Protein backbone atom coordinates (compact mmCIF):
# COMPACT_ATOMS: atom_id res chain seq x y z
CA UNK A 1 0.00 0.00 0.00
CA UNK A 2 0.95 3.68 0.08
CA UNK A 3 2.50 3.15 3.53
CA UNK A 4 5.10 0.73 2.13
CA UNK A 5 7.72 3.47 1.62
CA UNK A 6 5.90 6.52 2.99
CA UNK A 7 7.29 6.85 6.52
CA UNK A 8 10.65 8.61 6.21
CA UNK A 9 12.66 11.63 7.31
CA UNK A 10 15.16 13.93 5.63
CA UNK A 11 18.41 11.98 5.34
CA UNK A 12 20.71 14.96 4.76
CA UNK A 13 23.35 15.69 7.39
CA UNK A 14 22.56 19.43 7.28
CA UNK A 15 19.02 20.51 6.41
CA UNK A 16 16.58 23.20 7.49
CA UNK A 17 13.38 22.30 9.32
CA UNK A 18 10.47 21.49 7.00
CA UNK A 19 6.83 21.63 8.04
CA UNK A 20 4.04 19.29 6.86
CA UNK A 21 1.82 21.16 4.40
CA UNK A 22 -1.33 20.01 2.62
CA UNK A 23 -0.95 20.85 -1.08
CA UNK A 24 -4.43 21.41 -2.52
CA UNK A 25 -4.29 20.68 -6.25
CA UNK A 26 -6.45 22.35 -8.88
CA UNK A 27 -8.95 19.47 -8.82
CA UNK A 28 -9.13 19.83 -5.03
CA UNK A 29 -7.21 16.67 -4.17
CA UNK A 30 -4.69 17.18 -1.36
CA UNK A 31 -1.32 15.53 -0.72
CA UNK A 32 0.97 15.97 2.28
CA UNK A 33 4.29 17.65 1.44
CA UNK A 34 7.18 19.27 3.31
CA UNK A 35 7.45 23.05 3.01
CA UNK A 36 9.93 25.66 4.20
CA UNK A 37 7.44 27.61 6.35
CA UNK A 38 4.84 26.35 8.88
CA UNK A 39 1.88 26.75 6.56
CA UNK A 40 -1.16 24.54 7.06
CA UNK A 41 -2.34 24.31 3.44
CA UNK A 42 -1.08 25.32 0.01
CA UNK A 43 -3.39 25.73 -2.99
CA UNK A 44 -2.14 25.24 -6.54
CA UNK A 45 -3.83 27.79 -8.83
CA UNK A 46 -5.23 27.40 -12.31
CA UNK A 47 -2.88 29.07 -14.79
CA UNK A 48 -4.63 31.59 -17.03
CA UNK A 49 -2.03 31.50 -19.81
CA UNK A 50 -2.87 27.89 -20.67
CA UNK A 51 -6.42 28.97 -21.52
CA UNK A 52 -7.10 28.99 -25.26
CA UNK A 53 -7.70 32.26 -27.15
CA UNK A 54 -11.30 31.45 -28.10
CA UNK A 55 -12.21 30.82 -24.46
CA UNK A 56 -10.29 33.85 -23.18
CA UNK A 57 -12.35 36.20 -25.36
CA UNK A 58 -15.52 35.02 -23.60
CA UNK A 59 -13.78 34.17 -20.32
CA UNK A 60 -12.46 37.74 -20.00
CA UNK A 61 -15.94 38.80 -18.88
CA UNK A 62 -16.33 35.52 -16.97
CA UNK A 63 -13.09 36.14 -15.06
CA UNK A 64 -14.53 39.41 -13.72
Amino acid sequence: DSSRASLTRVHRQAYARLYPVLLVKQDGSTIHIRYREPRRMLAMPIDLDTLSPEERRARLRKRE
Binding site: L22, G28, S29, H32, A43, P45, D47, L48
Partner: protein, 138 residues
Protein backbone atom coordinates in the same frame (compact mmCIF):
# COMPACT_ATOMS: atom_id res chain seq x y z
CA UNK B 1 37.86 22.08 -46.32
CA UNK B 2 38.78 24.14 -43.26
CA UNK B 3 35.25 23.88 -41.86
CA UNK B 4 35.22 20.10 -42.26
CA UNK B 5 38.46 19.70 -40.30
CA UNK B 6 37.08 21.72 -37.38
CA UNK B 7 33.84 19.72 -37.17
CA UNK B 8 35.75 16.45 -36.79
CA UNK B 9 37.70 17.87 -33.83
CA UNK B 10 34.68 19.32 -32.00
CA UNK B 11 33.60 15.95 -30.58
CA UNK B 12 36.84 15.61 -28.58
CA UNK B 13 35.14 17.52 -25.73
CA UNK B 14 33.35 14.85 -23.70
CA UNK B 15 29.88 15.46 -22.28
CA UNK B 16 29.67 16.70 -18.68
CA UNK B 17 26.94 15.70 -16.23
CA UNK B 18 24.48 18.36 -15.03
CA UNK B 19 24.90 19.07 -11.28
CA UNK B 20 22.07 18.03 -8.96
CA UNK B 21 20.83 20.71 -6.57
CA UNK B 22 19.47 18.24 -4.01
CA UNK B 23 22.89 16.76 -3.21
CA UNK B 24 24.65 20.14 -3.12
CA UNK B 25 24.33 21.61 0.36
CA UNK B 26 23.21 25.26 0.49
CA UNK B 27 25.87 27.68 1.70
CA UNK B 28 23.50 29.38 4.15
CA UNK B 29 23.49 26.18 6.22
CA UNK B 30 27.17 26.63 7.10
CA UNK B 31 26.36 29.55 9.41
CA UNK B 32 26.37 28.51 13.07
CA UNK B 33 23.53 30.92 13.88
CA UNK B 34 21.19 28.52 12.05
CA UNK B 35 21.98 25.70 14.48
CA UNK B 36 19.56 23.79 16.68
CA UNK B 37 20.38 24.05 20.41
CA UNK B 38 20.85 20.24 20.42
CA UNK B 39 18.85 19.61 23.58
CA UNK B 40 19.70 16.30 25.23
CA UNK B 41 17.24 13.44 25.67
CA UNK B 42 15.90 11.89 28.86
CA UNK B 43 16.51 8.28 29.84
CA UNK B 44 12.83 7.32 29.69
CA UNK B 45 12.54 8.75 26.18
CA UNK B 46 15.46 6.66 24.92
CA UNK B 47 13.65 3.54 26.13
CA UNK B 48 10.48 4.47 24.25
CA UNK B 49 12.40 5.15 21.04
CA UNK B 50 14.48 1.97 21.35
CA UNK B 51 11.53 -0.32 22.08
CA UNK B 52 9.57 1.37 19.30
CA UNK B 53 12.33 0.73 16.76
CA UNK B 54 12.47 -2.91 17.87
CA UNK B 55 8.75 -3.22 17.14
CA UNK B 56 9.36 -1.51 13.79
CA UNK B 57 11.91 -4.15 12.76
CA UNK B 58 9.36 -6.95 13.18
CA UNK B 59 6.40 -5.04 11.75
CA UNK B 60 8.40 -4.26 8.62
CA UNK B 61 9.43 -7.92 8.41
CA UNK B 62 5.79 -9.03 8.44
CA UNK B 63 5.07 -6.41 5.78
CA UNK B 64 7.83 -7.80 3.57
CA UNK B 65 6.49 -11.32 4.17
CA UNK B 66 3.08 -10.41 2.75
CA UNK B 67 4.66 -8.72 -0.28
CA UNK B 68 6.91 -11.72 -0.91
CA UNK B 69 3.97 -14.11 -0.55
CA UNK B 70 1.81 -11.97 -2.84
CA UNK B 71 4.41 -12.09 -5.61
CA UNK B 72 4.75 -15.84 -5.08
CA UNK B 73 0.99 -16.34 -5.40
CA UNK B 74 0.82 -14.21 -8.55
CA UNK B 75 3.80 -15.91 -10.19
CA UNK B 76 2.43 -19.40 -9.57
CA UNK B 77 -1.03 -18.37 -10.80
CA UNK B 78 0.40 -16.85 -13.99
CA UNK B 79 2.65 -19.84 -14.68
CA UNK B 80 -0.21 -22.32 -14.29
CA UNK B 81 -2.26 -20.32 -16.79
CA UNK B 82 0.62 -20.32 -19.27
CA UNK B 83 0.93 -24.09 -18.91
CA UNK B 84 -2.81 -24.60 -19.41
CA UNK B 85 -2.90 -22.27 -22.42
CA UNK B 86 -0.05 -24.14 -24.13
CA UNK B 87 -1.84 -27.48 -23.78
CA UNK B 88 -5.24 -26.09 -24.80
CA UNK B 89 -3.98 -23.96 -27.71
CA UNK B 90 -0.24 -23.81 -28.49
CA UNK B 91 -0.72 -21.03 -31.05
CA UNK B 92 -2.53 -18.85 -28.51
CA UNK B 93 0.16 -19.56 -25.92
CA UNK B 94 2.91 -18.31 -28.23
CA UNK B 95 1.18 -14.93 -28.53
CA UNK B 96 0.73 -14.70 -24.75
CA UNK B 97 4.48 -15.00 -24.07
CA UNK B 98 5.39 -12.17 -26.45
CA UNK B 99 6.40 -8.78 -25.07
CA UNK B 100 3.70 -6.12 -25.03
CA UNK B 101 4.74 -3.38 -27.50
CA UNK B 102 2.23 -0.69 -26.49
CA UNK B 103 2.68 -1.32 -22.75
CA UNK B 104 5.12 1.57 -22.31
CA UNK B 105 5.26 4.38 -21.44
CA UNK B 106 3.47 3.29 -18.25
CA UNK B 107 2.52 6.31 -16.13
CA UNK B 108 0.85 6.10 -12.72
CA UNK B 109 0.12 8.72 -10.06
CA UNK B 110 0.21 8.13 -6.32
CA UNK B 111 -3.10 8.15 -4.46
CA UNK B 112 -3.96 11.52 -2.95
CA UNK B 113 -4.83 12.09 0.70
CA UNK B 114 -8.36 13.39 0.03
CA UNK B 115 -10.47 12.90 -3.12
CA UNK B 116 -10.92 15.88 -5.45
CA UNK B 117 -13.70 18.27 -4.44
CA UNK B 118 -16.26 18.41 -7.30
CA UNK B 119 -16.98 22.16 -7.00
CA UNK B 120 -13.59 23.72 -6.27
CA UNK B 121 -12.40 26.93 -7.94
CA UNK B 122 -8.63 27.38 -7.40
CA UNK B 123 -7.67 31.08 -7.25
CA UNK B 124 -5.91 31.51 -10.59
CA UNK B 125 -2.25 32.48 -10.70
CA UNK B 126 0.88 31.63 -12.70
CA UNK B 127 3.72 29.09 -12.53
CA UNK B 128 7.20 30.56 -13.06
CA UNK B 129 10.15 28.16 -13.31
CA UNK B 130 13.50 29.31 -11.90
CA UNK B 131 15.50 26.30 -13.13
CA UNK B 132 18.99 27.41 -14.13
CA UNK B 133 20.79 26.59 -17.38
CA UNK B 134 24.25 24.97 -17.39
CA UNK B 135 26.11 25.00 -20.71
CA UNK B 136 29.39 23.15 -21.24
CA UNK B 137 32.16 25.37 -22.63
CA UNK B 138 35.54 24.17 -23.90
Amino acid sequence: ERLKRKIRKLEKATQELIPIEDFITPLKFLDKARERPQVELTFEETERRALLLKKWSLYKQQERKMERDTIRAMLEAQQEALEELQLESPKLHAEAIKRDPNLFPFEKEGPHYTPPIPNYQPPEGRYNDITKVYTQVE
